[PDB]
Coordinates of C-alpha atoms and ligand atoms in Angstrom, one line a residue:
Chain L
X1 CA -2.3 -28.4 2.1
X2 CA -5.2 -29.9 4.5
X3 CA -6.5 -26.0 5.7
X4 CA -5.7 -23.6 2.2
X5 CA -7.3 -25.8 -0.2
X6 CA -11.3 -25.2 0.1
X7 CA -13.8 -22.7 -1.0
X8 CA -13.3 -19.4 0.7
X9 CA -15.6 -16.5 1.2
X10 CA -14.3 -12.2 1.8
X11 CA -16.5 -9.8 3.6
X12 CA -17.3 -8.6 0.1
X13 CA -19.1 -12.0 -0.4
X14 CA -16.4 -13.2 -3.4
X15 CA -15.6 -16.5 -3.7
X16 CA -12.3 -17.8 -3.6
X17 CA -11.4 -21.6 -4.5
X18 CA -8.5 -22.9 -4.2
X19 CA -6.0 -26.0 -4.5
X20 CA -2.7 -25.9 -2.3
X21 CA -0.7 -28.2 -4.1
X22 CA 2.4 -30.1 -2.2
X23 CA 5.2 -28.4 -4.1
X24 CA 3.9 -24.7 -2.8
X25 CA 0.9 -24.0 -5.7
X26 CA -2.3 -22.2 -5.5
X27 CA -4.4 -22.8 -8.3
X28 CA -8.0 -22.0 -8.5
X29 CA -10.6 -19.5 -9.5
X30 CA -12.6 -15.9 -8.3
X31 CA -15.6 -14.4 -8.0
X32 CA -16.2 -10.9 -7.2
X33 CA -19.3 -9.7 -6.0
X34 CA -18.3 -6.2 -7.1
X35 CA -16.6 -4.3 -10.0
X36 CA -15.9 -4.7 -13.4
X37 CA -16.3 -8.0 -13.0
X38 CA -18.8 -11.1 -13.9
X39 CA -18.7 -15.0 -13.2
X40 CA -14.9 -17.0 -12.6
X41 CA -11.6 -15.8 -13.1
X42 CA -8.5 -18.2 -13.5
X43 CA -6.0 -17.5 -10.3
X44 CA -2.8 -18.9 -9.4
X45 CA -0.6 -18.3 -6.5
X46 CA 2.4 -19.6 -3.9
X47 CA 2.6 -20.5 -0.3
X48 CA 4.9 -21.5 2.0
X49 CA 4.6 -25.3 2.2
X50 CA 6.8 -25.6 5.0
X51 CA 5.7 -23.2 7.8
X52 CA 7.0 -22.4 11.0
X53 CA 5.3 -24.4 14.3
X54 CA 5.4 -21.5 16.6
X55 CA 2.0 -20.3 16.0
X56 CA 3.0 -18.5 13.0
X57 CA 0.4 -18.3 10.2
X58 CA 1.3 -19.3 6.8
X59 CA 2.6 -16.6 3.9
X60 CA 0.8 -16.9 0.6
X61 CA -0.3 -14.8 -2.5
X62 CA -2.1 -15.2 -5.5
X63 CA -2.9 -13.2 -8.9
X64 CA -5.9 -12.6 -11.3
X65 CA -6.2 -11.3 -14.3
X66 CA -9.7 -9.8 -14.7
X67 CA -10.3 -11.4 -18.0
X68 CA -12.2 -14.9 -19.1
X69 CA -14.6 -15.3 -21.9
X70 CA -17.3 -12.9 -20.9
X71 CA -15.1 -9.5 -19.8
X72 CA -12.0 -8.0 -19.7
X73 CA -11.7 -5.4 -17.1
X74 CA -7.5 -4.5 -18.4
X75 CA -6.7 -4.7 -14.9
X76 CA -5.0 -7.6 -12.3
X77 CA -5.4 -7.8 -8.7
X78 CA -2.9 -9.4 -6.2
X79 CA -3.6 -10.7 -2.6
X80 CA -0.9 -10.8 -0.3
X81 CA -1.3 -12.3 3.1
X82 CA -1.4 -15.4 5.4
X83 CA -3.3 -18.4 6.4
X84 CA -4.4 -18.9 9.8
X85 CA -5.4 -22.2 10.7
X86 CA -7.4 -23.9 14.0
X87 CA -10.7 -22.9 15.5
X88 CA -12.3 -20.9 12.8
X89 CA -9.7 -20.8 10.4
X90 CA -9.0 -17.3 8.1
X91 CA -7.0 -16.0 5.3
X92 CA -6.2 -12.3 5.8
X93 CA -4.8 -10.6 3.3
X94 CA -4.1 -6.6 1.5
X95 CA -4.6 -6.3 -1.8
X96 CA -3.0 -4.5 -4.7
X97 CA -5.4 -4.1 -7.8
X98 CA -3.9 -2.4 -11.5
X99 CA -5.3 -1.2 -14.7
X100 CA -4.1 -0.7 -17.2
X101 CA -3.1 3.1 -18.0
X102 CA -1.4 5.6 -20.1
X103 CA 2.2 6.8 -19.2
X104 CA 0.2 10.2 -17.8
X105 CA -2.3 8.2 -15.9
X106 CA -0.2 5.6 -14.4
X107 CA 0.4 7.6 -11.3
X108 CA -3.6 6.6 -10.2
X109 CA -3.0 3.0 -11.9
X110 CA -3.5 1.1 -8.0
X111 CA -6.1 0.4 -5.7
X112 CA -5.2 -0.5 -1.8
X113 CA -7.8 -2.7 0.4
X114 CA -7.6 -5.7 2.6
X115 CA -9.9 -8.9 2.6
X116 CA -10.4 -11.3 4.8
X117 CA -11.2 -15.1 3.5
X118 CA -13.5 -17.5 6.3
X119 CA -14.8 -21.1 4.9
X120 CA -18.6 -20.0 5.6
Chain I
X1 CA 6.3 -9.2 -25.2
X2 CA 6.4 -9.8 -21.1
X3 CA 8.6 -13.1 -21.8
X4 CA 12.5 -12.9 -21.2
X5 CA 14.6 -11.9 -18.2
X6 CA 14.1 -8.4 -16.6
X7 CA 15.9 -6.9 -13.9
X8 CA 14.9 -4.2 -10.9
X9 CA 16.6 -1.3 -9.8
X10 CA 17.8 -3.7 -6.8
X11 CA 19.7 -5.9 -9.3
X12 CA 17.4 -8.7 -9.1
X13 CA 16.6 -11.0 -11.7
X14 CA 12.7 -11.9 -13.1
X15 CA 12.8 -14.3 -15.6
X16 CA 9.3 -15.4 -16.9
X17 CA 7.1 -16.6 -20.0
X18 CA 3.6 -15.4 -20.8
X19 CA 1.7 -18.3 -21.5
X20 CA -0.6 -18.0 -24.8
X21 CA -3.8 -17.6 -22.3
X22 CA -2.9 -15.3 -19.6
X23 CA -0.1 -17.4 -17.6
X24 CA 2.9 -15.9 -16.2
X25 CA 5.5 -18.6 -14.8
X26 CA 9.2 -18.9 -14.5
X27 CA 11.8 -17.5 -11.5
X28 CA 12.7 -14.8 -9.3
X29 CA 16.2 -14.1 -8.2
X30 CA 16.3 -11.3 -5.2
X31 CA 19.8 -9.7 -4.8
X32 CA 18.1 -8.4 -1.2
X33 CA 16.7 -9.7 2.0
X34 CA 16.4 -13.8 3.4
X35 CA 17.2 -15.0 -0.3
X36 CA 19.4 -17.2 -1.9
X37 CA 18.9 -18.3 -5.5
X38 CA 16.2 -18.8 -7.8
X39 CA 12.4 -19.1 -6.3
X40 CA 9.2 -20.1 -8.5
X41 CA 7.2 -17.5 -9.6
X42 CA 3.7 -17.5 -11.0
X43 CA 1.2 -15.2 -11.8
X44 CA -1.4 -14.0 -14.3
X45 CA -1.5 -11.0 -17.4
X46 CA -4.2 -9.3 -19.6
X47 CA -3.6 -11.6 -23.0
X48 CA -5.9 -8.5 -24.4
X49 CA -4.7 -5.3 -23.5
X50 CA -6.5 -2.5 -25.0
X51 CA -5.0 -1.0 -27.7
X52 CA -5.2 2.6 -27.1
X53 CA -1.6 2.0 -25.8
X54 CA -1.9 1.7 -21.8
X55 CA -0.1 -0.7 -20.5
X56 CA -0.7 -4.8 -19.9
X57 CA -2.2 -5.3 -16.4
X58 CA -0.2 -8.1 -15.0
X59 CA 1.0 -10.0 -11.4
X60 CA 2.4 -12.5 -9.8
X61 CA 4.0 -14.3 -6.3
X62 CA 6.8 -15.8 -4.9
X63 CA 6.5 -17.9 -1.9
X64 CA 10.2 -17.3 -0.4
X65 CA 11.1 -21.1 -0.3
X66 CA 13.1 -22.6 -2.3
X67 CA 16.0 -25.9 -1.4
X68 CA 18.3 -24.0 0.4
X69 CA 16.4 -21.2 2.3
X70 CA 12.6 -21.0 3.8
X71 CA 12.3 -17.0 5.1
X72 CA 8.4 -18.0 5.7
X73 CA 7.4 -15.3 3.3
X74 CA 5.4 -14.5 0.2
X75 CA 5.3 -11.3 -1.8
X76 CA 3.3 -10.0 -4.8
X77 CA 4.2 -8.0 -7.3
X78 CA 1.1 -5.9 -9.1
X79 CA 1.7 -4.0 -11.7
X80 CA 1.9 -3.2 -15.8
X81 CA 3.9 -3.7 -18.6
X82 CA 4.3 -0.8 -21.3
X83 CA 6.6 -2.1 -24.4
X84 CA 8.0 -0.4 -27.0
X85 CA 11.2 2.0 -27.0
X86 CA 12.1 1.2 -23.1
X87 CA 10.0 -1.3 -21.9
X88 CA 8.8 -1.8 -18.4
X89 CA 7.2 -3.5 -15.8
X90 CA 6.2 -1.0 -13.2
X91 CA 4.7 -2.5 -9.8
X92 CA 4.1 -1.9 -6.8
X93 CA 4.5 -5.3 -4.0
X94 CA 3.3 -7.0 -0.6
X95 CA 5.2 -8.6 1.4
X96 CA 3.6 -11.0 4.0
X97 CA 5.4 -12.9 6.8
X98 CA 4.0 -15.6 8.8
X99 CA 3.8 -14.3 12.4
X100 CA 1.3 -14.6 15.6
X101 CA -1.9 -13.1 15.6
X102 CA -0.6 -10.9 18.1
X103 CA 2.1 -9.3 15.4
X104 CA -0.3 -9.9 12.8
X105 CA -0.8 -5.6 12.6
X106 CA 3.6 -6.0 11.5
X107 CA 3.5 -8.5 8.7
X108 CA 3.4 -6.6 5.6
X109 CA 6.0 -4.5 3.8
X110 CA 5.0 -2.3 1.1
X111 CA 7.1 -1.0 -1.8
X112 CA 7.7 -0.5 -5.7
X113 CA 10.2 -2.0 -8.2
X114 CA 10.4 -0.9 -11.9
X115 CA 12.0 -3.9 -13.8
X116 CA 13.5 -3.3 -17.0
X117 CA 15.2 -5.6 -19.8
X118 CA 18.8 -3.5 -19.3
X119 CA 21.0 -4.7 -16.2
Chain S
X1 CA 20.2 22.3 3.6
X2 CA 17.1 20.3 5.1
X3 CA 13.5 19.9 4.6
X4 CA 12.3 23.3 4.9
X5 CA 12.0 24.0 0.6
X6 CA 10.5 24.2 -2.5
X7 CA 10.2 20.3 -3.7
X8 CA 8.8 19.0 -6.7
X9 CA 7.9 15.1 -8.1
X10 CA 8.2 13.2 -10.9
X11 CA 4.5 14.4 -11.9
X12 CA 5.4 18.0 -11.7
X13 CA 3.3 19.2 -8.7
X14 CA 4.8 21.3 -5.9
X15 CA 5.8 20.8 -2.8
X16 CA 6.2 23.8 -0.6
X17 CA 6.9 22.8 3.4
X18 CA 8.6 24.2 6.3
X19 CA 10.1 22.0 9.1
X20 CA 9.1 23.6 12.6
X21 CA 12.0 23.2 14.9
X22 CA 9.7 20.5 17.1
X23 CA 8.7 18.4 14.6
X24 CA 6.0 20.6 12.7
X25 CA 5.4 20.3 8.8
X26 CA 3.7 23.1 7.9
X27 CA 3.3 24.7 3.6
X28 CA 1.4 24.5 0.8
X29 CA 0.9 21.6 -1.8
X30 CA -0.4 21.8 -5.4
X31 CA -0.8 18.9 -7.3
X32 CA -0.3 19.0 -11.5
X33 CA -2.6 16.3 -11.6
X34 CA -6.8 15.1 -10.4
X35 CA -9.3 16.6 -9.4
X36 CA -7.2 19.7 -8.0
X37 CA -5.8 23.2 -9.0
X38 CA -4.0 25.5 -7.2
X39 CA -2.6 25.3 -3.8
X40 CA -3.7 23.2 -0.5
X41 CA -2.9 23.3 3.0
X42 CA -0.8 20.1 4.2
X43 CA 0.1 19.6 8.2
X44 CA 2.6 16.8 9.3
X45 CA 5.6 15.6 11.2
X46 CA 9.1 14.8 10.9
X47 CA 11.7 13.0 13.0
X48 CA 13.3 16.4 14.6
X49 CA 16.5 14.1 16.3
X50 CA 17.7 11.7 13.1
X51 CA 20.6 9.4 13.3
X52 CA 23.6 10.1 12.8
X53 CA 24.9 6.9 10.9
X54 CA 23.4 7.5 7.6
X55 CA 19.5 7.0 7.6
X56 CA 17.2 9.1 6.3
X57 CA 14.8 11.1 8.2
X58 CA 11.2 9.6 8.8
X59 CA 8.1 12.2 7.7
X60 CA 4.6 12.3 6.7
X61 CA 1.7 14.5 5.6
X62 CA -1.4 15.1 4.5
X63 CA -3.6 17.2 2.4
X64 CA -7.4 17.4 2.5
X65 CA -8.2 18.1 -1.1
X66 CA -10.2 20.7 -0.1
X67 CA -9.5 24.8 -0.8
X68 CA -11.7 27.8 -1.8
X69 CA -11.5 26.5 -5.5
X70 CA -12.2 22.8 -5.8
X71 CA -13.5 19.9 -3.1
X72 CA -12.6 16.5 -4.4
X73 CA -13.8 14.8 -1.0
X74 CA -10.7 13.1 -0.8
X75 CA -7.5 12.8 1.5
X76 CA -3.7 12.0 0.5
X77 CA -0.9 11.0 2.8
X78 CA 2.7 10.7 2.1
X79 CA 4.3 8.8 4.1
X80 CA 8.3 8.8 3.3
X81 CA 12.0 9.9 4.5
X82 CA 14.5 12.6 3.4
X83 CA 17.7 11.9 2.1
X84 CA 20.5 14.4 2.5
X85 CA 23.6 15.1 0.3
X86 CA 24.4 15.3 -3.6
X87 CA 21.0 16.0 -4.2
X88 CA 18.7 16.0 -1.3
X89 CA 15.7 13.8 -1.8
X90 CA 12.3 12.7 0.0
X91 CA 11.2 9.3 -1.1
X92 CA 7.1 8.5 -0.3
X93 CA 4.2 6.7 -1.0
X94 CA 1.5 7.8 0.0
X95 CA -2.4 6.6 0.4
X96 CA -5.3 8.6 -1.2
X97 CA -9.0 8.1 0.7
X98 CA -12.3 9.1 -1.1
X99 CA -15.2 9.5 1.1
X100 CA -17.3 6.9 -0.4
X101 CA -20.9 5.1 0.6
X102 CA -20.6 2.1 2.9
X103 CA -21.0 0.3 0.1
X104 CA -18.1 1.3 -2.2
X105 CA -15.6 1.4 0.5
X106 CA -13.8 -1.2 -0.5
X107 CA -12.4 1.0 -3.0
X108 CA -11.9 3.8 -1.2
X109 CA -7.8 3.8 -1.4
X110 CA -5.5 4.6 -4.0
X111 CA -2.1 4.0 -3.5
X112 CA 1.5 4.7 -5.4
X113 CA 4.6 6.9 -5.0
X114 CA 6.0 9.9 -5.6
X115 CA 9.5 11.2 -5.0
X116 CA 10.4 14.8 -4.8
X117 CA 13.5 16.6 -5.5
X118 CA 14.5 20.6 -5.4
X119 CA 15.2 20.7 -9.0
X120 CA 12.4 22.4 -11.5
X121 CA 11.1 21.1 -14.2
X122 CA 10.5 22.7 -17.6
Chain B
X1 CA -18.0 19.0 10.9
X2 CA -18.9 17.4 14.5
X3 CA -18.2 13.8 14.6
X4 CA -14.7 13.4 14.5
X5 CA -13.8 15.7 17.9
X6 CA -13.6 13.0 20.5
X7 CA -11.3 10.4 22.0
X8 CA -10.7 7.2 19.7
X9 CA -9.7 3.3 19.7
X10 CA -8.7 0.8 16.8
X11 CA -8.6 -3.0 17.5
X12 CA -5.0 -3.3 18.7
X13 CA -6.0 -1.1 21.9
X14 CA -4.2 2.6 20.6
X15 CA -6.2 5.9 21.2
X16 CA -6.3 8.4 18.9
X17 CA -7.1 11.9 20.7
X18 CA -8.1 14.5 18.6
X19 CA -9.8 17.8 17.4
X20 CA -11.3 18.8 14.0
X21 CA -10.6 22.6 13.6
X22 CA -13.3 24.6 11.8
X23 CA -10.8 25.1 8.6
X24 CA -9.8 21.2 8.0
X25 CA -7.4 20.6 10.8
X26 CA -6.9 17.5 13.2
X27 CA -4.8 18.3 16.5
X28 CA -4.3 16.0 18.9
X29 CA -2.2 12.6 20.5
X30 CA -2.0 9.6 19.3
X31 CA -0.4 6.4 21.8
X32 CA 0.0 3.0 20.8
X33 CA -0.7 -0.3 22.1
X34 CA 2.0 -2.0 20.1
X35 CA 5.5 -1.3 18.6
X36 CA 8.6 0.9 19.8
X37 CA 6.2 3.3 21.6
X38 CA 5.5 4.6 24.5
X39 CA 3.1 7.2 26.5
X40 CA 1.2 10.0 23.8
X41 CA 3.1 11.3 20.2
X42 CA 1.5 14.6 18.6
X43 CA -0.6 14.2 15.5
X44 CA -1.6 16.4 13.1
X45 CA -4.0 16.0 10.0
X46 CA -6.4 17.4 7.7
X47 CA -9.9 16.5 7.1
X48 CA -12.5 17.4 4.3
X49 CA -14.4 20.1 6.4
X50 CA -17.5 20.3 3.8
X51 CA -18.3 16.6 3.3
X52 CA -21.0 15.6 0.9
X53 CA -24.2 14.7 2.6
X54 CA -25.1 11.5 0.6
X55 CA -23.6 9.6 4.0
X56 CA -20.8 9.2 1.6
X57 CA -17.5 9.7 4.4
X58 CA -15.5 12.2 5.3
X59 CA -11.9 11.9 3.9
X60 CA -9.4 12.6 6.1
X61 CA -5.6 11.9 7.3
X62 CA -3.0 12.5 9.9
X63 CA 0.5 12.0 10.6
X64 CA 2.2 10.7 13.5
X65 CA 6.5 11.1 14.0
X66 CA 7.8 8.8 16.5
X67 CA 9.5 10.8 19.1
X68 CA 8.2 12.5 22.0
X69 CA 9.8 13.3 25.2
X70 CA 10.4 9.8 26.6
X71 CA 11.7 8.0 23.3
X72 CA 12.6 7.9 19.3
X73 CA 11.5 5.1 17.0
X74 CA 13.1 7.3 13.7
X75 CA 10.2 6.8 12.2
X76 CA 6.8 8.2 11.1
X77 CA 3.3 6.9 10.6
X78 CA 1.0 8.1 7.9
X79 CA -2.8 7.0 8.9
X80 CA -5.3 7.6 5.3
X81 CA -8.6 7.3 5.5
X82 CA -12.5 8.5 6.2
X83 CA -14.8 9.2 9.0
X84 CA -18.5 7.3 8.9
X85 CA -21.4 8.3 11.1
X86 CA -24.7 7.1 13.0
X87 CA -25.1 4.6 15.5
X88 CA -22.0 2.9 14.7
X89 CA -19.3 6.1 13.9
X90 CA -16.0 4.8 12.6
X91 CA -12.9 6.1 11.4
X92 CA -11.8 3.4 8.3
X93 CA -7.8 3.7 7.9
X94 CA -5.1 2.5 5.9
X95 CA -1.5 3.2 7.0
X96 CA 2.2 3.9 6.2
X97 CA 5.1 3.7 8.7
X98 CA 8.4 4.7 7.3
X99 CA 11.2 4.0 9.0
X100 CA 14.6 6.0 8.3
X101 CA 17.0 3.5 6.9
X102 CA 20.2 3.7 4.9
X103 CA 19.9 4.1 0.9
X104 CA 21.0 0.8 0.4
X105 CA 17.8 -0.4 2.6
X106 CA 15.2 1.7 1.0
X107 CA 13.7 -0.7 -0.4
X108 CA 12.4 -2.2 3.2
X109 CA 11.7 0.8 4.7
X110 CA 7.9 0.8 4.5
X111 CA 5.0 -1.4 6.6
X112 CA 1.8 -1.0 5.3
X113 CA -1.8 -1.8 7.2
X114 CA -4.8 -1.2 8.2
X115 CA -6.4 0.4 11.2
X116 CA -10.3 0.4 12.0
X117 CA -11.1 3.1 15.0
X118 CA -14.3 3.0 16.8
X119 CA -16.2 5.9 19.1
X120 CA -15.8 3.8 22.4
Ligands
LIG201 O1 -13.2 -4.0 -11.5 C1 -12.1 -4.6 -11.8 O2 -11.1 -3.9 -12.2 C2 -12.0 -6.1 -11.7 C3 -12.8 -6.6 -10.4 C4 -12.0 -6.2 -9.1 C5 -12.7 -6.6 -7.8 C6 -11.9 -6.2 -6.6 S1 -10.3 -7.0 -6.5 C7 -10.1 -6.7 -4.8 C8 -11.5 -6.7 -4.2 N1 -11.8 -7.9 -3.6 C9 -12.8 -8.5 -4.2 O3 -13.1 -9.7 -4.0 N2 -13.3 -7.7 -5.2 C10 -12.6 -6.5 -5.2
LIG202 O1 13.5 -11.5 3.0 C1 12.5 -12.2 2.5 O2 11.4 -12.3 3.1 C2 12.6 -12.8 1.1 C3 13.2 -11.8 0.1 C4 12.4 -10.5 0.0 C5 13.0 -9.6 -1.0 C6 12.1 -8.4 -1.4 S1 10.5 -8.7 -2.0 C7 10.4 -7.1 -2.7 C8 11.8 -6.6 -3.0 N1 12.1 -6.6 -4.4 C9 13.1 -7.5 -4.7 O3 13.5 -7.7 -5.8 N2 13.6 -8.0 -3.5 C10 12.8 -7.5 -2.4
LIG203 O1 -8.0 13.9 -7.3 C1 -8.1 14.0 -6.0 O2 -8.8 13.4 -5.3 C2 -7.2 15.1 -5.4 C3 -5.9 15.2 -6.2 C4 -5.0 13.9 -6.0 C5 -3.6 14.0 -6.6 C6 -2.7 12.8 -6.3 S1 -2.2 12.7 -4.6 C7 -0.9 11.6 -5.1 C8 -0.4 12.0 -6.5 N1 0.7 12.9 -6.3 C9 0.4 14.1 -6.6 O3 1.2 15.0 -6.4 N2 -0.8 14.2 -7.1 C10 -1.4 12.9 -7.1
LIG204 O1 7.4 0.9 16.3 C1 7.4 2.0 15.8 O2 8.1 2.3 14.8 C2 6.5 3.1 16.3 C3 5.2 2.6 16.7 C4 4.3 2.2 15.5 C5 2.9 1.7 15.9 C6 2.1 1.2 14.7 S1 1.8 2.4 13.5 C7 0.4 1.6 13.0 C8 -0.2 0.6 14.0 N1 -1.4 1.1 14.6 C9 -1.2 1.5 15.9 O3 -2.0 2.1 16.6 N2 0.1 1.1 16.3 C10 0.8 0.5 15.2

């Protein structure tokens, strides 16, 4: 897809690039500027390659694990959200992060935010 | 020991395979909402969980289109996996719809499934 | 019958409320689990008219974790409906806030949930 | 504390009346812009009355149920979040609705966002 695929930027100053492959695909890495976390991050996702015309954006999501080669922060972060194409284009999404936990602590396992992706 | 087929407390059906280096892939089937079927899932786990026994930090999405149904939709699950004597994937999901900027402030559902290996 | 009880969730805490016949939830809460102990005021609301075909009753509250013991700087709302019948039930999830810096306010917010039920645990 | 005492807006257009009580409580109305609502709904929320003073926020929540005089939604709003001061005061929210539903649809019964309020 000719407006997902790109290099993305959050209000955090993470960086988000991506490949929207034809058969619905995300595929990519992240940076984030903050927490336990330190250069690229594999990432893979889904979108809806066939979106409505009305004006509707597009619904997407993707997953990292916070481990590569340098760290592993035992915890995974899903974006939820949808593309917005046009004038200055955006991805705006809400975010679910987990760690890993014991039975006991699994009740403060997840983190809530939103982000919001622009191309500069 | 993520890959097989799970099942929520909503009867659906999660089958998946965790890839040697942090993959997850495989299908959703929801027994709920604008679904029909089996929809591609994929998504991403810690290949290196800490042993001091927490749980696997794991995720992943569907895109709610598959050949015979497009609900313009995508949720996530986020979650972990704790093995052993009942294993589970606890998580809690997102929901985004495609709408107008104007019902932008509407487009997310929030909620929790527990999937486990028993029907 | 109704919300006005002694509840308690899956974590243990304690869930002590009265339903004020316009809406009002008014009790104490004390969490088994945190930076907490002992009890906390909570304020709220309820859906004082429900349907009649079934649904649950709509309800939320809060608690500032603050009380003459402990400050944890830090908020929780549930947000959730009661269920009637066999066993009556109030299904939530709720949303914690930490005051944080500017800065770390992008983790700010905590967020699972908790059901309650009348029955104690031992 | 002071700040919070005042009349309200977040970017959809709502306002968000209320008054922090010397003891941790919020008081007030609360009318939306958007949704199955219509003229003010009565609030009510607590608030960390002895904040830190590092400029770290104030934590604080309230609760909204959809029904006042003119109209019922059956359902209740759940607003989480803190205060922030100086020139550019702001109240930072994420939020719950719950709608009543039947047991068998539970599992949609919840919209989550997010709700940035601003001192005028
Ligand atoms: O600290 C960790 O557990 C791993 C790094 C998490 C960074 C979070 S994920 C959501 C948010 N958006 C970002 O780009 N960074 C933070
Ligand atoms: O209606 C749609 O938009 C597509 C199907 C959504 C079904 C939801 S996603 C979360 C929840 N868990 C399930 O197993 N199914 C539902
Ligand atoms: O640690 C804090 O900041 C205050 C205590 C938080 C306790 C949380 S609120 C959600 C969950 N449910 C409970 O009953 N207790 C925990
Ligand atoms: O439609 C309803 O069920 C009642 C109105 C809900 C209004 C929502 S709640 C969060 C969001 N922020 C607002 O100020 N209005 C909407």
């Amino acid at each position: 897809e000719a407006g997902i695929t790109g290099t993305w930027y959050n209000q955090l100053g993470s960086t988000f690039i991506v490949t929207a492959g034809a058969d619905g695909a995300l595929t990519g890495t992240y940076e984030s500027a903050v927490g336990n976390a330190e250069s690229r991050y594999v990432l893979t996702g889904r979108y809806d390659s066939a979106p409505a015309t009305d004006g509707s954006g597009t619904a997407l999501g993707w997953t990292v694990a916070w481990k590569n080669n340098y760290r592993n922060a035992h915890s995974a972060t899903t974006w939820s959200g949808q593309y917005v194409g046009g004038a200055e284009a955006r991805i705006n999404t809400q975010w679910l992060x987990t760690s890993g936990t014991t039975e006991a602590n699994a009740w403060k396992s997840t983190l809530v935010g939103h982000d919001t992706f622009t191309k500069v």
